[PDB]
Amino acid sequence: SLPRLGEPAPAFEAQTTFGPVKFPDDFKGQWVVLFSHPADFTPVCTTEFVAFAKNYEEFKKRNVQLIGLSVDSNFSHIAWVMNIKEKFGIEIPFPIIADHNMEVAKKYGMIHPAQSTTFTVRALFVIDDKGILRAMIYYPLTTGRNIREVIRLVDALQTADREGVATPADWVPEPQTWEFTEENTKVIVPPPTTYEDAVKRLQEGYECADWYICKKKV
Amino acid sequence: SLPRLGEPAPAFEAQTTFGPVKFPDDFKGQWVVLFSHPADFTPVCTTEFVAFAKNYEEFKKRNVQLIGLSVDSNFSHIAWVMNIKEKFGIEIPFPIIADHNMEVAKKYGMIHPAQSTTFTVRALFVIDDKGILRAMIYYPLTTGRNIREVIRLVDALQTADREGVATPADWVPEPQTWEFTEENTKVIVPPPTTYEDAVKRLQEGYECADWYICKKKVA
Amino acid sequence: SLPRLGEPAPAFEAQTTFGPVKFPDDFKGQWVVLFSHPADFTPVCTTEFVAFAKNYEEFKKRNVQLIGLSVDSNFSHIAWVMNIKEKFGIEIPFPIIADHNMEVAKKYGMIHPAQSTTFTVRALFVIDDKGILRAMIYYPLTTGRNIREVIRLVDALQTADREGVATPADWVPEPQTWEFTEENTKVIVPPPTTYEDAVKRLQEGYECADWYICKKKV
Amino acid sequence: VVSLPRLGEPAPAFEAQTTFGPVKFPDDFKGQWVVLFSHPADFTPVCTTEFVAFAKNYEEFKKRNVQLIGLSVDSNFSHIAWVMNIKEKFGIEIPFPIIADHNMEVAKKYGMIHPAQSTTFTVRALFVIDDKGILRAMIYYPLTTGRNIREVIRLVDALQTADREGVATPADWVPEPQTWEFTEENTKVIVPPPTTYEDAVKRLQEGYECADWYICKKKVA
Amino acid sequence: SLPRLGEPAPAFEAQTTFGPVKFPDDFKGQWVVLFSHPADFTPVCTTEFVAFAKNYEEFKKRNVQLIGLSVDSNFSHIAWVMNIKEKFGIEIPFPIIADHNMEVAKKYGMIHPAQSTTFTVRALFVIDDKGILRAMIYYPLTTGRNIREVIRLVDALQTADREGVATPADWVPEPQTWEFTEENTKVIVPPPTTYEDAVKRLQEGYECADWYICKKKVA
Amino acid sequence: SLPRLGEPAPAFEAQTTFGPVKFPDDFKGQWVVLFSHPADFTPVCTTEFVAFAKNYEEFKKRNVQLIGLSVDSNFSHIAWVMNIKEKFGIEIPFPIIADHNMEVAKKYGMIHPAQSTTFTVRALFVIDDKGILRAMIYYPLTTGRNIREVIRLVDALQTADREGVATPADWVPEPQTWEFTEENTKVIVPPPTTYEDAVKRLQEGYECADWYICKKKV
Amino acid sequence: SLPRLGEPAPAFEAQTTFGPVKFPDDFKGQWVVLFSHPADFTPVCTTEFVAFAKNYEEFKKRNVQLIGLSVDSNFSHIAWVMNIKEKFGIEIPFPIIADHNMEVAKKYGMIHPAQSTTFTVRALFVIDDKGILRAMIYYPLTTGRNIREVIRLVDALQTADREGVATPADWVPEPQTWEFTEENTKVIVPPPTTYEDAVKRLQEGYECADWYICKKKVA
Amino acid sequence: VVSLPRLGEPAPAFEAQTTFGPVKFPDDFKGQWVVLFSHPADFTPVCTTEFVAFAKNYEEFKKRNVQLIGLSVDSNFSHIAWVMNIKEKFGIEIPFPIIADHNMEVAKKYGMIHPAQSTTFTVRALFVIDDKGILRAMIYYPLTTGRNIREVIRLVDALQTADREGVATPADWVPEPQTWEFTEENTKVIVPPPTTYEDAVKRLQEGYECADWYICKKKV
Amino acid sequence: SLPRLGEPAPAFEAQTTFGPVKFPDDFKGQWVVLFSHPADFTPVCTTEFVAFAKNYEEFKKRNVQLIGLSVDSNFSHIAWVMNIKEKFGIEIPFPIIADHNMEVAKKYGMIHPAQSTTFTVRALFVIDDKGILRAMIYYPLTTGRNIREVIRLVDALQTADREGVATPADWVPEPQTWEFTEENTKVIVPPPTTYEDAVKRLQEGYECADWYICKKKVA
């Protein structure tokens, strides 16, 4: 079903890479960006986690707790975070929910069967300091999210609350430039789904940080 | 429910690290050892996978297809197989089922809620070349299995079928000795459950091949 | 149905060769290996009872109470224990439940109708000192169990509880050797099912301790 | 349940394993009279004395075209072991089949389970069935009390004479004058069998006349 | 249904040749042999009543109350006892229940429709001094009972209770001989069912004490 | 329920002292006087059977088939007829139904529970040559019937049919006198209900033809 | 339904030629002969009423209250009693119930539809001094009753109660003779059913006291 | 129920016994007008005066093609006895049939039973039914109150005139000028009839003008 | 359903040409003649209202309150009374109920659908001083009522109550003659049902007091 804007975010308790969480009660007084990703050790997800990690202080100074979610186990989460540290030198600084039985995913409408009957889509929810769902995004499995738009959305909602205003199309709090570089143009090869293919993938001439994350340009 | 001995093993189609499988149709004419493990990147499971892999030729010459299973995705499975290869020098030579939605696990009674509502226990099923369930074991999350007993069980079942006999307690096909060394006495530290604990775990002085698999001896 | 690992072992009261038992109330503070056998006066079962009996001190020193079970009467049980003492020189030192109406067997999933609608399979259950089911095995009618693996399983479970550890594949508490001899290679002739065949069986040239237990090599 | 089998109607049909192989009852014994009887448990003492008495009278039943067949809830392997035991301890080989009614299905069809007697064992039920498979007469004795084998023979004679001659038979009828002798040996009573292994070991040390742990006799002062 | 061994004998109130009875309450403290017979003025029945009457002291010294039962009226019962006294010189010394509407018969499983939808079979029940049903037999309409086996059964049950023992096959309390004479070989002609046949029956060459009880011998 | 005047008499098949009967198939073309009596070997009943037997030719010349009925067996019936022949010198010339299970009695409303739950009352039914119930009487256990009134009733019903007339109160076909003698004033001692009382009854000084039929005067 | 012998007679309240009655409350301590007749102004009924009236003292000396019943109104009843007095010289000395809506008749099973759906049959009930139904008869519309047998029945019932005895077949309290004369042999012509036929009936040469009561003799 | 019979609809059909034989109603009277009326009880006085008045006017109804027919819950044998009584006591022979409706089946169809009047007798109902079997008019008088026979005749004239000429008739309409005379005899009232035989005997000694025990007259 | 003689007349509250009425409570101690008429401005009805009005004193001296009723409105009632006064010189002296929704008409069985589904028939009810319904008549739409018979009926009912007597056929309290003159022989032309027909009716040569009431004589 459809999570409802302006109502308390669906409550849950779950294991995370930071320990157990009571959501959103454990984050009262903080804004929360809750997002989901289909699967540990898949490539778009890795680029999104790295981008969120690189922007962690941008969220922290906005009183935003980032928290990810997939249907993977907490042990797979830790392994993936370890892998990201090994292959990219970046340590994920925010918790990831282990939603094994899809109980949280279903509360948030994150399972779209034509996309996948087993993985979440790329859902993202902005939740305010009172636990109220404020905004949401549902991107498909193919398509990585825009992390700066998440920051802008948080800025827009916090400004609206603080000042009693609305924000127009394309609003930002101060003049700014979003640079997208040559690196932002590289596309992702869909990851291998067999071990034999994963071994072959590393020999196909792509730019691969690991078997599951290979880039090229279009 | 309890899967029933002497009845066809519950049929299923599943995704695996070797591609899709239609069970047991794809394995007619082969014996099958189907076993489950709670989670990729956990230590008892890793020691079991290495032991099965090292014993892969023992099963192959007995016309046994090994097939593992957990509720993890194939992407976790592949990463885990890569990790074991780097840390232990063995390439897992048998498929692992990605039973994402626990549909196969429930058909086999592999989910025991007091053990885990999300992970399978350490279940193992010996299935004959006709797809019939012949024997089964359910060990808990704490306790690694005895791979040589799985081989003995297969031998006993194959000998019973081939010769029209039964096999007594402690039966083996020829005299033999199962040696357990000092290496087999090391116990496993329960794996870390937070990333912070996983980083600290590697600094605690245990015998660790990776953050999730640290061993020690009892004193 | 499937007994549940980690939950209290299904409770029952039963008659045994040692008198009535209330399970698991009578065994609080002791580990219990409850196992079933299809039928008194059948050969695989006899070899297993002898093996358990020979290892009785191994179980006792581990605070384990052994307890057998079949659907036979207590009078059949006593006759069988008397027969084993006479033919093999060993006195069964542990109780056998007479589960005539299959009430306990069904609570433990011991009846697999394609194996037999009248006899239990070779089920075995490890139960801890608080009555919790810890592990279980289901072997078919053809196939005797591995008694040393039952002891190892007990050791691994007790070490796990005592030390707060897990045990790897093929774990033992100290280096050791399980020797299997030429005697362990003899197979069992399926027992006769008519009195005439039982009389003829003793004249067929096998190695027979009694009409129902004849061995040969393959 | 506990339903009474009906006299004059076909004996309740069943298929079962026996010490002689599988039986389809009563179809396999069509054209023969049948004495179907039950006993609570293999390796119990009154039962042994009854099986010995039936075995000793096997030719009396055979000459009357009577198939004896026993029944208990014990397995066929217990049955064979018990027949082996009787042969060794008494020198008598049981010459008729014993049904293994593992799950009490036959016992319930014949009203043989009386819960105040036992919820697990049959009582001492006995059924005379004619050559057309019709139930003709039946007896239900309790666990304590062995049956009278000569009265079973007399009952068969009386029913066969009734059928052959179109007559009824009076009280105490016999086909020819005869004397049923009961000797001093027939006065010995049975000590209730031990029900634990320890008690069975102790029972053999109590000074009785015991052919085996489960069958000890004495006289009543 | 089948009366249950080891349970209280089914209770009832009825008229008898000795007056009204509340069963088994009126005979508590005595053992009871309750038996049924299909019909007054029929021949096997007469021979059984005479045999029980002759053995009345054997039952009395064992604290046993004999009581018969049929679906005939009490007036038919008294008439039949009078007839037995007139024709045989024997006075029936125990009561006969008048179970006019088959209510008691049904409680004891005495009606077997393939035998008769109107008459009881030859049922007999041994009931102890506590009112518990101990043993029972069901003989068909053709076949008279064995009175000495009833006595032996009582002895065996009383000995079991008194001594805490079981009794073997063919047990007796003391050595003894049961003689069956030439007189015991006479068979019974099925009784006539019409008045004309009853008159003719007396001219057919049998040994008839009355129209309904004719004997002969067979080869 | 009350059998209905003017309607076919309830049909039945029954055993009798003359063999099986099918009512009304066997009696088409004959009038039928069906009557019941509570019990063989009881005194009022005996006096009634003797009176009907003595009047048998009166019924026969009127094309009337007499048929009695009680819930007693045919063996009791025959014994009672034999007894009546010996004590009174008359052979019952009409059949007696053995209505063992009260099925006919209930069809005819012959069971009145306050009188007896096991015996019929003194019911009598006149049935014509077409099987139609024409008249009925129900007397209690105490009170013998009037046999000449039964004959008168038949005459009146047959005259009505033959002549197309009705018959007045006290009608007879020709002048006549019903004599009742000193013998008709003797009353009946209620029969003994125990064997002991029956033996004593024969010693009490009444006018007794047998234990069950003793008379006196008032 | 058939009223039950030995049970209280069905209670009712009704209008009669003597005034209202409550049955059996009004007749406690008296015996009651309740009888019904199909219709006022019909001939058998008239002969029965005259016969009962002539025997009124015989009933009174036996503590018996006679009470008749038909479905006719009290006005028809009174007119009929007037007619009987003029034609036969007897005044009906007992009450007649006006059972307009057949409520009493139905309680007593007096309506037999094949006889009449509107008239009672010739039912008669003897009821004792405690209100208990003791005996009953049902004669058809064609056939007048026997009044002396009603008296004999009352005597037999009262003697049974008084003496604790039964009465045999054909019992009377003292020797006596029931005389039936030439007058008792005349039959009744079925009454006319139209006014025109009633006028013609009086001209047909029968022995007629009135249009509805004409007698003749047979052949 | 009970129902009001409905004006303008077929008169409720029935078959019944009458003093003239069986009738199938209103079927046997098709082509004739019918005056069906009920009376509580044979051998009661108001009813007798009404039957005499109808009998005396029988020719007036006959010439208007009207069949008179009475009805009560009394038996046909009571009916015949009552007509015989009227002939003996008054010299008048009832010339029309009387229905014997013992089981009130017809009475119920016509709403003739009013339990507060009587649960056993009909009231004084009267129904005019035309030659097509259609119910045209009805009146219900109580047990106390005899009917007006000339008003029944006038009602018949009015209905037949309406049908024949296609007109309506005003209040108090008659087909030709006429005079209805009521005499001194018409002023005598009726003593309610005795209901016990003893009272019926005593009634004849009370000094009234009694043609019979049930019909005694006096003046007010 | 038929209103019940001998019971309270169905109660109602209604508007009338004299104001609201509570029926029959407002007439306690008075007799009531309640009558209905199909429709204001129709001819038979007019003749009946004039006849009742002319006889109003006859009713008053008998303690009788006349009250009419139709389904027409009170404004149509008042208009019709005005019309009657203008065309006939008579003032209606009793109330007319306006029973617009037929509620009273249905309580009194005044709606006979084959006569009219919208108008009452010519019903009339005599109700005594206790509100008890005593007598009733139902005449059809074609046929005017007889006003003197209504008075005679009241006299007969009041005399019955006062004297404890019944009144015979054709009873009157004193000798008298009801004269019907030539004027009583004129019949009524059925009234026009369209405005056009009403205009044309006045040109047909009849004796018309108004468009709706035209009289003639018939041969």
Side-chain angles (χ1 to χ4, degrees), chain C residues 16-20 39-42 71-76 78-79 81-82 85-87 91-92 100-102 117-119 191-196 198-199 202 210-212, chain D residues 17-21 41-44 73-78 80-81 83-84 87-89 93-94 101-104 119-121 193-198 200-201 204 212-213:
Chain C
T16 82
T17 52
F18 286 29
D40 297 356
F41 297 99
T42 62
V71 300
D72 306 294
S73 83
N74 218 43
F75 302 109
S76 180
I78 295 165
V81 171
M82 292 284 186
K85 186 177 59 179
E86 294 186 349
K87 306 300 181 179
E91 186 168 69
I92 298 309
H100 175 259
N101 289 352
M102 302 191 179
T117 55
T118 61
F119 309 138
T193 63
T194 69
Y195 174 74
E196 181 184 47
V199 175
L202 288 175
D210 203 353
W211 62 271
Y212 66 93
Chain D
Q17 182 59 225
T18 81
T19 54
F20 285 31
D42 297 355
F43 298 100
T44 61
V73 299
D74 305 293
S75 85
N76 211 43
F77 301 108
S78 287
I80 294 166
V83 171
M84 291 284 186
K87 185 178 58 179
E88 176 186 325
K89 305 298 183 179
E93 187 166 68
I94 298 309
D101 185 37
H102 318 86
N103 292 352
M104 303 190 293
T119 55
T120 62
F121 309 136
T195 62
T196 70
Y197 174 76
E198 180 187 46
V201 175
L204 289 175
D212 203 352
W213 62 273

Side-chain angles (χ1 to χ4, degrees), chain B residues 13-63:
Chain B
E13 299 186 14
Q15 182 60 236
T16 84
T17 55
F18 285 30
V21 52
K22 185 169 180 281
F23 194 105
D25 312 6
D26 288 354
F27 303 115
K28 287 186 178 288
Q30 305 170 245
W31 289 65
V32 177
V33 170
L34 167 69
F35 70 105
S36 64
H37 66 279
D40 297 356
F41 297 102
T42 62
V44 176
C45 304
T46 301
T47 71
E48 290 177 321
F49 268 70
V50 169
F52 273 119
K54 285 178 174 189
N55 282 277
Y56 171 76
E57 292 295 334
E58 293 294 331
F59 286 100
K60 185 173 158 186
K61 73 188 199 181
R62 296 167 167 84
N63 189 233

Side-chain angles (χ1 to χ4, degrees), chain H residues 20-66:
Chain H
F20 285 31
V23 54
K24 185 171 180 177
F25 192 100
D27 315 6
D28 287 356
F29 305 118
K30 288 182 180 287
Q32 303 168 261
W33 292 66
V34 176
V35 170
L36 165 68
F37 70 107
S38 67
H39 66 279
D42 297 353
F43 298 100
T44 60
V46 176
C47 302
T48 302
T49 71
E50 290 177 321
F51 271 71
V52 168
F54 273 120
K56 285 177 175 189
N57 283 277
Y58 170 76
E59 292 293 336
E60 294 295 330
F61 287 100
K62 185 172 158 186
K63 73 189 200 181
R64 295 167 166 84
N65 193 8
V66 172

Side-chain angles (χ1 to χ4, degrees), chain G residues 18 49 52-57 65-66 81 90-95:
Chain G
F18 285 29
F49 267 71
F52 275 118
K54 285 176 175 189
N55 282 277
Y56 170 77
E57 294 296 334
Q65 174 68 62
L66 289 168
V81 171
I90 172 62
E91 187 168 69
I92 297 308
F94 54 86

Side-chain angles (χ1 to χ4, degrees), chain D residues 31-204:
Chain D
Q32 303 170 257
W33 290 66
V34 177
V35 172
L36 165 69
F37 70 110
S38 67
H39 68 280
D42 297 355
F43 298 100
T44 61
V46 175
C47 302
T48 302
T49 69
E50 290 177 322
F51 269 72
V52 167
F54 275 116
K56 285 177 174 189
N57 284 276
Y58 171 76
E59 293 296 335
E60 294 295 331
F61 286 100
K62 186 172 159 186
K63 74 194 309 181
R64 296 167 166 84
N65 194 10
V66 173
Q67 172 67 62
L68 288 166
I69 181 155
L71 179 151
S72 80
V73 299
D74 305 293
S75 85
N76 211 43
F77 301 108
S78 287
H79 286 351
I80 294 166
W82 188 40
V83 171
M84 291 284 186
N85 172 264
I86 291 170
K87 185 178 58 179
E88 176 186 325
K89 305 298 183 179
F90 299 98
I92 266 97
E93 187 166 68
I94 298 309
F96 53 86
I98 314 168
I99 294 160
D101 185 37
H102 318 86
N103 292 352
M104 303 190 293
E105 288 178 12
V106 180
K108 287 173 178 155
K109 290 178 174 173
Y110 280 81
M112 299 173 180
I113 309 298
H114 294 247
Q117 283 270 284
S118 174
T119 55
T120 62
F121 309 136
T122 63
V123 299
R124 306 184 185 281
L126 183 147
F127 303 93
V128 182
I129 295 156
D130 67 21
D131 56 312
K132 302 165 281 185
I134 298 294
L135 178 61
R136 303 295 295 271
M138 69 195 138
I139 285 171
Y140 295 82
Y141 277 18
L143 301 179
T144 52
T145 303
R147 288 160 282 203
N148 182 331
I149 276 67
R150 281 175 291 204
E151 171 58 17
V152 177
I153 297 170
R154 191 196 74 85
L155 175 55
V156 169
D157 281 335
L159 293 161
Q160 293 183 340
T161 295
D163 289 359
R164 186 184 63 253
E165 304 288 338
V167 300
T169 56
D172 304 316
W173 178 86
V174 288
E176 64 192 348
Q178 58 193 250
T179 279
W180 301 4
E181 186 175 347
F182 300 85
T183 62
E184 186 64 22
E185 183 65 29
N186 295 125
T187 70
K188 295 179 182 177
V189 298
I190 280 167
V191 185
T195 62
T196 70
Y197 174 76
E198 180 187 46
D199 287 352
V201 175
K202 300 178 169 309
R203 173 55 51 75
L204 289 175

